[PDB]
Amino acid sequence: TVAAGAAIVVPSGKQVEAASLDIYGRPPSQLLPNERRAAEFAAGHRRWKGFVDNSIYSWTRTLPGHDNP
Amino acid sequence: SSKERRMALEDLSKWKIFLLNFLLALTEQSCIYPFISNLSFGPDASILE
Amino acid sequence: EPIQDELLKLLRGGWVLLSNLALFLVFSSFLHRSLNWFVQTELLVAVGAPQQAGERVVGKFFEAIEWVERNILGWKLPGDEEAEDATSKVYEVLQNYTPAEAAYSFAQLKYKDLTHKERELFHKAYALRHFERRDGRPGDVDAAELQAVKDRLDPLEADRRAYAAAKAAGRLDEYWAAPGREATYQRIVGAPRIA
Amino acid sequence: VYKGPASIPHASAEVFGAFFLATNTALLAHMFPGKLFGSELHVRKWDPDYLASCCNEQGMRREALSGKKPNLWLLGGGPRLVNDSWERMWWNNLHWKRWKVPRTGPAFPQDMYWQ
Amino acid sequence: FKNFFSFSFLNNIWSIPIIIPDIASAMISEVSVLDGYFHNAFTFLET
Amino acid sequence: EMCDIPEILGTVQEARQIVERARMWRFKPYGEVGLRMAQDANGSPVSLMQEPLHYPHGT
């Protein structure tokens, strides 16, 4: 679960450069330590949302609409 | 100490008791006469200045 | 009898004691947290409505079922749009529901010399920031015009900082050759600068 | 007469007797300072701040006599490299120093009052 | 875990140098001159 | 009624007395103001010599 989750979450260098270049104006290895972790977290959160959208939510939306209260 | 075990004396059991008192010297332990025990000869509050 | 065996046996005893104590504390924490719900269910029984308490219990089960439906499976569960609109965050309330007169910047009260443009610049820098306004992007305030306004008010502190900067470097006679420094030395100290 | 399987450890009654008497005597010794044959009971020998100040004194004195600029070593830790506040930059040493009065103690009244 | 496999008590910074401000950068309103030739900004060597 | 010169001198004398008694509350040891606002040439905190048992560096 920890390693299985870390396979989904942990990004590579291109995501970290991608998450740094739009949130901040600067390429990586030019930042404070606290503002590198924001780019790393944004890349990991994007990976999590993408995995949930394309691999868990592609086949569970078959519309069994019921069971309200 | 509550089990009152009794061997003679061996080298490993010699090193056990040395290690216990050595490691207790590095912690903070209770005292009964602290103002007498912290006295020093010379103009200091302790022996560590 | 070896040191390794004694350390391992101590480690196992400490681990089993700590794990069972943590389990007891987790159960006690749950028992502290959930007391109000059981008390309200018991009061609903005791007021004279015994059938409505079972509705509360099966509503807790159905709330767990609804959570499983919404989060894991991802189904819509209609009526959620009316629930989403009921609440809001603090910064969204600041963006959408508050007047601009309910925010100030400590310098519109301190300096009477300010114009309207410097007042709104201080307002955007310090009172309502870019995340607290509707059409607010980061980098709205220049921070160079703000420094120019902060140097126009109280200029002698800016002169002192310029002196300290020139003294840290080797530009001290370049400090004294600025067109106003000898004149303000003459004005403050009643004698000309000999050095 | 059957106690147990003898592979599960049994604690003796002397352990509980010593525990009971020692807890009661520790409470009585904390309530009455000056009456432990004229003395009192302390829980440490030296204050950690006092020890660290002595060690910093000797360290910077030895650094100065060797021809270098002296360094002060900080309890808790050194600075964080940030740019938003002074308190966030120096948080670890500030956190050590804010805990001074409860670290010194005690948490019980220092003098006896008769209700 | 990456920092625990490393020695976080070994490469971190625990010490700072202490530099005394000169009089121009100090508490200027506390510096007074007493009947001429004296001032209360004290400075002495440990020796 | 406006103060004459001796009343002004007397109240300046008494106010200086009051200011000395007021500055006796200025550096509470391990207080928050001393911990955050006593700094060196840079912004680094200093170890003020206010501890009750240790008088370092020949003091």
From Swiss-Prot, chain E:
Q: Which residues cross the membrane?
A: 4-24
Q: Where in the cell is it found?
A: Plastid, Chloroplast membrane
Instruction: Tell me its family.
Output: Belongs to the ycf78 family.
Described function = Essential for cell growth. May be involved in binding chloroplast DNA to either the chloroplast envelope or the thylakoid membrane.
Q: What is this protein called?
A: Uncharacterized membrane protein ycf78
The organism named in the record is Chlamydomonas reinhardtii (Chlamydomonas smithii)
Q: What is the lineage of its organism?
A: Eukaryota, Viridiplantae, Chlorophyta, core chlorophytes, Chlorophyceae
Q: Which gene encodes it?
A: ycf78
Span within the parent record: 50 to 96 of 1995
